[PDB]
Amino acid sequence: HMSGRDISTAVVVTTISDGGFLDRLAPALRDAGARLIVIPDRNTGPALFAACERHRRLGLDVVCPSVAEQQDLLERLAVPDLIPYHSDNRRNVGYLMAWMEGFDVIVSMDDDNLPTTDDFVERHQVVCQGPRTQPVTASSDGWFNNCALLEVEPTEVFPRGFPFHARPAHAQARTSVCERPADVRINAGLWLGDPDVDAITRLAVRPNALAHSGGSVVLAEGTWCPVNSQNTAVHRDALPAYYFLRMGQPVDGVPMERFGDIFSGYFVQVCAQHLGHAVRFGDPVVEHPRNEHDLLDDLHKEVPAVRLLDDILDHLRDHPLEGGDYLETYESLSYALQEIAERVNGRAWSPDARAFLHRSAHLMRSWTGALRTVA
Amino acid sequence: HMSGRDISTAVVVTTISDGGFLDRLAPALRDAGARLIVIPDRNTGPALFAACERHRRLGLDVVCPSVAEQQDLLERLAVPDLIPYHSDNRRNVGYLMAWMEGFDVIVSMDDDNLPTTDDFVERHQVVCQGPRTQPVTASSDGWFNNCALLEVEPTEVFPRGFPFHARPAHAQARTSVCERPADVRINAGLWLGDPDVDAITRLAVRPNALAHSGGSVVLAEGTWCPVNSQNTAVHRDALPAYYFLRMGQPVDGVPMERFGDIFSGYFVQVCAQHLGHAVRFGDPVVEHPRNEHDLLDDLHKEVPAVRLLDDILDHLRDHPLEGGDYLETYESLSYALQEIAERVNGRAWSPDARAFLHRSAHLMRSWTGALRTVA
Amino acid sequence: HMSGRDISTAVVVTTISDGGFLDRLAPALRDAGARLIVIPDRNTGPALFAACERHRRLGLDVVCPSVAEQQDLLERLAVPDLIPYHSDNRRNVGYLMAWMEGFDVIVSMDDDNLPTTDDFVERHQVVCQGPRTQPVTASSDGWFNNCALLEVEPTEVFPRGFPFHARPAHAQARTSVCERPADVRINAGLWLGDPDVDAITRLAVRPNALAHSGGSVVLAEGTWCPVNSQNTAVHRDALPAYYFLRMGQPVDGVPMERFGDIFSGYFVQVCAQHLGHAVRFGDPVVEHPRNEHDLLDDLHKEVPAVRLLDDILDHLRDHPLEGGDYLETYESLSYALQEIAERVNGRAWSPDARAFLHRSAHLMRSWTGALRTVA
Amino acid sequence: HMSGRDISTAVVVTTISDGGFLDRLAPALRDAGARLIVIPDRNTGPALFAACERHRRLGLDVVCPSVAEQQDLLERLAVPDLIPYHSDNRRNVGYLMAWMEGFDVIVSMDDDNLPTTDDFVERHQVVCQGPRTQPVTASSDGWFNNCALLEVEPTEVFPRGFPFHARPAHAQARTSVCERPADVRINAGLWLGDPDVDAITRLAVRPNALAHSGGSVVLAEGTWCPVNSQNTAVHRDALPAYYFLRMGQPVDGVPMERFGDIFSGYFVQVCAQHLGHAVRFGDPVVEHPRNEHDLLDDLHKEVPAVRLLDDILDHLRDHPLEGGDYLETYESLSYALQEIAERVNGRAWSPDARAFLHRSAHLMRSWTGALRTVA
Ligand SMILES: Nc1nc(=O)c2ncn([C@@H]3O[C@H](COP(=O)(O)OP(=O)(O)O[C@H]4O[C@H](CO)[C@@H](O)[C@H](O)[C@H]4O)[C@@H](O)[C@H]3O)c2[nH]1
Ligand SMILES: Nc1nc(=O)c2ncn([C@@H]3O[C@H](COP(=O)(O)OP(=O)(O)O[C@H]4O[C@H](CO)[C@@H](O)[C@H](O)[C@H]4O)[C@@H](O)[C@H]3O)c2[nH]1
Ligand SMILES: Nc1nc(=O)c2ncn([C@@H]3O[C@H](COP(=O)(O)OP(=O)(O)O[C@H]4O[C@H](CO)[C@@H](O)[C@H](O)[C@H]4O)[C@@H](O)[C@H]3O)c2[nH]1
Ligand SMILES: Nc1nc(=O)c2ncn([C@@H]3O[C@H](COP(=O)(O)OP(=O)(O)O[C@H]4O[C@H](CO)[C@@H](O)[C@H](O)[C@H]4O)[C@@H](O)[C@H]3O)c2[nH]1
Ligand SMILES: [Mn+2]
Ligand SMILES: [Mn+2]
Ligand SMILES: [Mn+2]
């Protein structure tokens, strides 16, 4: 008479579209009874609110808090300046809302990611499995390429946020699997169509993801892979470390963008491994008919971040973190970044580059303080 | 009679000159038995070291630590990256050394400031008299113009770092003096010749300080005036809050300079008033035959900081500080600056302008951490 | 008696105001039968058009071409991109129109400059008297300070655009007057209230022009003074060289502004002296109750141009110009600026500072090309 | 008795190496009797001069003019500021020197391009063949990918400077060959090993050129392909249009670099087609064991240029050029770029981007004026 199993899932999507994406996203979420938290912005038209109510009458537990309601909640948490407007950083509101409402699983998605299977929510519930002995995947160079789990034309690619200095030698890395205890708390689902690559790779080969052929893997301690926020489930205990980093900080006078989830993906990952938890890559797989972007503009935004990421990732392996839970571990991580900001050296490490990590660390602790205020 | 009160004074000068300035600076120092700490840089010629040895044999207690000895000291204190080279920020090394060696008074000077009286060191010892009921000067607008204590041609001027928003209405402010308890811990001596004005004032009216006619004043709580580092005595208790702020941070892509002591002067002043201590302005007066500068280059370096100073000072009046001594109060101030960085608004507050306060706050706490590590 | 000399005057003002300034500007204009050309912008409210119609019925020959009519005119002249919107550069449209319509005198004014005498237009007609032996003023340093013709408190000031390298030694310069032939083609009227000083001078001493006490002067060949566009009459022959320089060019990454007329004033002045013509300073004097400005923002906009002006003016004294009229001489000047851009050296002459002169020269010739296309 | 055929060839290489590359470059040039003009810089060590003299005694007609000799020649041509130091732009000295000395063929190379066949110079003499009916290659989209003539792993690549907006649709372009009159004046030889790709492609797939399998092609009028300066022969008549563009101009405050020959390659190509001449791609093929570069630094330098190149190439097809030879056609091209600078629109077209084309056009005409002075 095994009963009592009931995992709650909330899907977080921020968007400025008219809401037409709900026609293909609602069926998977409606069949599973999950909640969808749509976060609009000041540049979001009134057609999105009309689409949420239309799908709410069809059985979808969808909410769409207006910017006034969002700002009131942030005001009451003493963080009115934390989350800016006209930015997809406002998905942090949905993360916080789902965390306050006690959901077990928080699935971050974008408005151009459509589930391909009916068990989309169920597959993301893997972050609630708990610790068990299971096949974990280790890599001799400390990196795993989740795009090697996909059939990609015209050539092999690496995901967005993968360090560039490790790519040429990655072909000689030794991949091994063995039975070990692991506790999956983050599940990064893969994507067909336009894979999550950086603008450099997209401008070079225009990749196309044909099929998910590699299955799913759980990464052992010491093996990393970037985690995005377009098809990623985070267990509610790990959510405090999943704050979407604020963009716009200049590197050599060039404002960075498009890497908010590259940092959050690595940050929640180094926090999970310090607490004995793991990151999973594989199913559920979505289609990514990506919104229309100017690739040269995407390149101009990503370069300031890619100029620093390899150094930051290298120094993060040197810093030991402290903390008993994800709140304390994330705060310890924020102070680790401030020490890294002054020790790292290179041509790209101008005074505004070093100060980027200092303001990021403050906003990280402003985010955890808001969660502590909610208690 | 009274005996046993042996007040120790250490003068701190950082320079890239050939040491010729020692000829006019040493007599007042060696006659008082004061120590002179000369901090050279990588761009400092070998003639300075020869001049320190020539004036040492004449009876001056002068020390001139090489950059290797400086870096060895800073590395042992776990701050090898705190103080940059090719910068007058290296005077922080002299601040640190004078504090380690237990000096009562630390006098910050530049290599073009020359004492005018034989009691130069004695007058600066006023930061050691302790609390006493004394005439304190208050101003209705909360600001005091120390250049009003001087006879200046061709017109009235304000000191460098004086907020611009308060200058037009300062003529209507009411100045009052009354007997109140005060504990002087900072004594900003005045300057004849080229007064300490900003590049705006120097380019506009080219002022010349003729004489010191206003005497000396002690500013009551709530009355502020910028404090520079070219003729300023700081009691050793207040020394932890007198860290010379690191420049080079861009504001809208323009690196700031020449305001490192404007911030230190206001920071030690806010910390002192929180602890019930006061700032004094007046004697001892020095001659300032200012080193040759490109005034348009000084303006280009000062404008980035000028654009933010009025806002920073306004928010500092609304942030009360915590702490029982200068170390705790300075750290409390550093955290207050990070809150101010996210609350302040204005066209000049770009993401790099806000990150300037965040990196500065970390550097302030890196400074206090080295001070704790010493003791 | 003498008859047949019908001098036509057109006043040119560009504005984003509501037109209330017309109440004090129209009387002197309509009493003299002068035309007022008001150039609105995209950011100009609809109240200006209603004010032009209200003052037209009172007898003022005022025209206010819509942005559509402006762009239609500029497109037909093959310069649709020459004059930007949301900028006071649009006064060039008024310059062009007044020149097409055959006016003898073009008076450039701002919407906060108000005549003080009934003979405002008559005094500006001095640019039409022709050559005659008259008292011309020469200065030993090659510069004249027109603000010395005014009673200014609290101290002596220089006009906006006056080179800084020459200010300290200008007090020692010898001013001489003697009878020489001169042909006045530019008449820069002076201003009471807020004088036309740079943001450096305004922030430093906040000057107030009390009265016009020095009379009027005509500057001999080799003696220069900046000429602004807020109360300046230009003879139609000299109008082709009075193009208002387009701002927005970065200098070390900082866009310049507020100096468009500093360049036009010096350019029309160098071209006039090459053709044997002269610049006059003095009456008619206007009141300048200056529109409200953020003075620190004015400083941020002016510094990029201030950093280059002294060098540009120095090289202009060593480049002789060719041409028989203002069109040919202005084009010769534009090519001279391109040679200067590659010869000048200095810390402020970054590749974008040099390219500023190259794009400006093309725009100057784009302007003269439209002038040739008109005629 | 067919005699009298004797084509002269000069190879131009600028380098800061110690001269060891001469051991593998001299045999091909010595066997053909060609001249090698090595252009050193101020950051070039004395070991290069010792290597040129060592190879000169072995039979190589190699010259290495010191920076004093280079600057004296430039001084006598009234272009002392045209060519900067610490830059590979100094290859323009070698272009000019070979042109003054009357060589028929000028082969631009870098110090890391080694010939693979003995007929290296002979194959480059094709630019002296003269007009004849020959197979010309046309493309329906107006672009040709010379990297498709090579066997490249791991996937197909495009050359550096190839427009990005045309790459996805290039696979559907129709390539056709037919007998037509053509006059080859530029021969772009291909490269094995590290192909001449942009940093985007190199950071994405790390290409490797295995073999030259496509043969050689001559491009018809209307079909373009970028031409670099690492293995390219230019007939002396076309050399005036082959000026290596000066880099360092900021685009949105980011200085461009590494595209000096991308512009010169397209510029000499549009000039050749207007004069009825053609560009050849294929043999002779060199090995490119490229010097060690930081690819992320290469990316940071190339992005400012790639942000504008697609627009510039599009507008160059709209502008008809004038001129009877390459000097007049290049000068007409320079004026065409100035008109393009004001008509083009886009986010990347900041004021400093538009001014880049204006200063480039001046330097282009400064280069032709120097060649006209040589006459
Ligand atoms: N509030 C708000 N304001 C905007 O001005 C605003 N403007 C767009 N958005 C929303 O942000 C989401 C992401 O946009 P895209 O999917 O179109 O762009 P991608 O390059 O595919 O996303 C990449 O970067 C993302 C984060 O940087 C990762 O999550 C992805 O994994 C990764 O592929 C969309 O839903 C969109 O509708 C706004 N939301
Ligand atoms: N280590 C090092 N490296 C350098 O590259 C380096 N370069 C110069 N220096 C030293 O810094 C001191 C100050 O220089 P100046 O007196 O010439 O400039 P001022 O405008 O007169 O000083 C103003 O600003 C100062 C702070 O910026 C305040 O202290 C003064 O109150 C205020 O008047 C001198 O001794 C000089 O020799 C270096 N020292
Ligand atoms: N088209 C348009 N668009 C705007 O966005 C736009 N915004 C303002 N304006 C108009 O430009 C005129 C000048 O503005 P201000 O008088 O307020 O500023 P000042 O500092 O006093 O003027 C100084 O600089 C001027 C040149 O920069 C010289 O002429 C003067 O000699 C000199 O004193 C006014 O009429 C105003 O209404 C616009 N016009
Ligand atoms: N005078 C001088 N001063 C320097 O400071 C200086 N520093 C280097 N050099 C010389 O310039 C040549 C090119 O350098 P690399 O071959 O190492 O770099 P690449 O990325 O392979 O070259 C790419 O860009 C070039 C032009 O931008 C094209 O020609 C090539 O086709 C294309 O592949 C070399 O010989 C080198 O030794 C200097 N020369
Ligand atoms: Mn997407
Ligand atoms: Mn000084
Ligand atoms: Mn005005």
Ligand SMILES: [Mn+2]
């Ligand atoms: Mn190379």
